[PDB]
Amino acid sequence: MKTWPAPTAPTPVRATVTVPGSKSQTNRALVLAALAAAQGRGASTISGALRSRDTELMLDALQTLGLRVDGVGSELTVSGRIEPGPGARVDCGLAGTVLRFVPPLAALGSVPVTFDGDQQARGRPIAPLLDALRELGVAVDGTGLPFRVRGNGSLAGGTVAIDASASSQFVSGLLLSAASFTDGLTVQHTGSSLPSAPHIAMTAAMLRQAGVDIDDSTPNRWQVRPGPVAARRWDIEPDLTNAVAFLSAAVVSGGTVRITGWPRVSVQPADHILAILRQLNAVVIHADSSLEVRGPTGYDGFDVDLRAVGELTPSVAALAALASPGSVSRLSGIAHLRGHETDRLAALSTEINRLGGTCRETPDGLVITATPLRPGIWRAYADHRMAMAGAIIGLRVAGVEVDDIAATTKTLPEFPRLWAEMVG
Ligand SMILES: O=C(O)C1=C[C@@H](OP(=O)(O)O)[C@@H](O)[C@H](O)C1
Numbered sequence: 328m329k330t331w332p333a334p335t336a337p338t339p340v341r342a343t344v345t346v347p348g349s350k351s352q353t354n355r356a357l358v359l360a361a362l363a364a365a366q367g368r369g370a371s372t373i374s375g376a377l378r379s380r381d382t383e384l385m386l387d388a389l390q391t392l393g394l395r396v397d398g399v400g401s402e403l404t405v406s407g408r409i410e411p412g413p414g415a416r417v418d419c420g421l422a423g424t425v426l427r428f429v430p431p432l433a434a435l436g437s438v439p440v441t442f443d444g445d446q447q448a449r450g451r452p453i454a455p456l457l458d459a460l461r462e463l464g465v466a467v468d469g470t471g472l473p474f475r476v477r478g479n480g481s482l483a484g485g486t487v488a489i490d491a492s493a494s495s496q497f498v499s500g501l502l503l504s505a506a507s508f509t510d511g512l513t514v515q516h517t518g519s520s521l522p523s524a525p526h527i528a529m530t531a532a533m534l535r536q537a538g539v540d541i542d543d544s545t546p547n548r549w550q551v552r553p554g555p556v557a558a559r560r561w562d563i564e565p566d567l568t569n570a571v572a573f574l575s576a577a578v579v580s581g582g583t584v585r586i587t588g589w590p591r592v593s594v595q596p597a598d599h600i601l602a603i604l605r606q607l608n609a610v611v612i613h614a615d616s617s618l619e620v621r622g623p624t625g626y627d628g629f630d631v632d633l634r635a636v637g638e639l640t641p642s643v644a645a646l647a648a649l650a651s652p653g654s655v656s657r658l659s660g661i662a663h664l665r666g667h668e669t670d671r672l673a674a675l676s677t678e679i680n681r682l683g684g685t686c687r688e689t690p691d692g693l694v695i696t697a698t699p700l701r702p703g704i705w706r707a708y709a710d711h712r713m714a715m716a717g718a719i720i721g722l723r724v725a726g727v728e729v730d731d732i733a734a735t736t737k738t739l740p741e742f743p744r745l746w747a748e749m750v751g
Pocket of ligand 1: 350493496522
């Protein structure tokens with residue numbers, strides 16, 4: 328595979344960028360549309376849907392379960408029933424949302440469904456959710472990929488306790504289908520350290536838009552009452568995590584990037600994101616239904632807690648590597664990133680140090696000292712966000728090439744073109 332050379336920015340980037348739909352919201356919408364359709368409420372359409380490997384895996388997973396998903400562009404229509412064929416096998420790829428959100432959904436069917444995924448997906452956490460499904464009555468063969476969910480057309484629900492410290496998607500995955508369990512569900516996260524609170528809140532918010540009653544008034548506990556899931560039209564926001572890769576270009580070059588269609592009120596953690604950018608003295612404004620970010624002339628080291636927004640770590644690590652020389656930055660709260668697409672703390676450490684940088688993995692994150700960097704091959708680990716972090720570095724370091732920019736197809740198949748258009 329040819330490498331992809333990351334274009335440099337010898338002068339401030341200036342651009343208006345449109346990023347496609349949110350992966351997290353798209354895949355929640357597809358699951359909820361499938362439940363409504365499986366419940367006999369009719370077809371649903373998702374407008375502005377992300378088309379990427381993770382959402383194609385999700386819609387193929389629903390089709391494996393018997394549903395129909397139509398649409399060649401960003402408008403997807405879900406219909407039909409859960410009625411899996413003999414030997415049904417969901418391919419999870421490297422999509423945690425498919426791996427975690429579809430096995431509950433599938434216990435509603437009356438035929439078992441096998442789950443498999445990429446070799447690299449088999450190293451990602453999944454066993455706690457399968458134990459929880461077993462506690463709720465579902466027969467599950469296997470404690471890791473490949474595993475089979477042997478449903479008998481129904482799932483009684485009830486109360487269940489789970490350690491979800493390794494992934495909020497263990498909670499989201501159970502919450503999304505719980506309205507179709509006979510008794511609904513009460514889910515209790517045991518212990519502490521629950522990452523990605525905004526993605527669980529995302530789940531709860533979209534469940535309420537589908538008419539589902541969910542009580543999240545007590546931390547670490549969620550009660551969902553049994554009831555209908557409405558068929559409705561979903562409007563998908565731009566992916567704000569992907570937007571940060573482009574906004575970072577403004578930050579490191581002292582330029583100006585605008586993102587179109589930014590929601591002033593979002594189901595995504597927009598407030599965390601904008602606060603972080605302002606930590607680096609970026610000027611952030613909302614204008615013309617767009618978000619504008621103007622980078623500072625330079626920035627020093629920063630400390631940032633990424634527990635609630637860990638998927639920002641690759642881009643934020645790149646920003647830290649590009650701070651003024653001798654700056655020290657501390658990224659914390661992200662032990663769980665050892666279980667992501669790749670171990671992102673080891674990978675970021677490895678690739679930054681290869682460019683001559685200074686990145687030290689810590690038990691919950693990274694400490695990065697900004698030092699002059701040099702050309703190299705920034706290696707993707709099949710991880711869309713590692714790939715875009717390489718692009719960010721390359722803005723300020725000539726001679727940086729990403730081995731596998733096509734890794735970006737996970738959530739942004741058009742990255743290479745959009746990025747070229749931005750940097751110009
Ligand atoms: O539910 C979601 O859509 C996701 C939740 C988070 O997972 P973890 O809590 O496992 O990090 C996030 O990092 C992931 O990229 C998307």
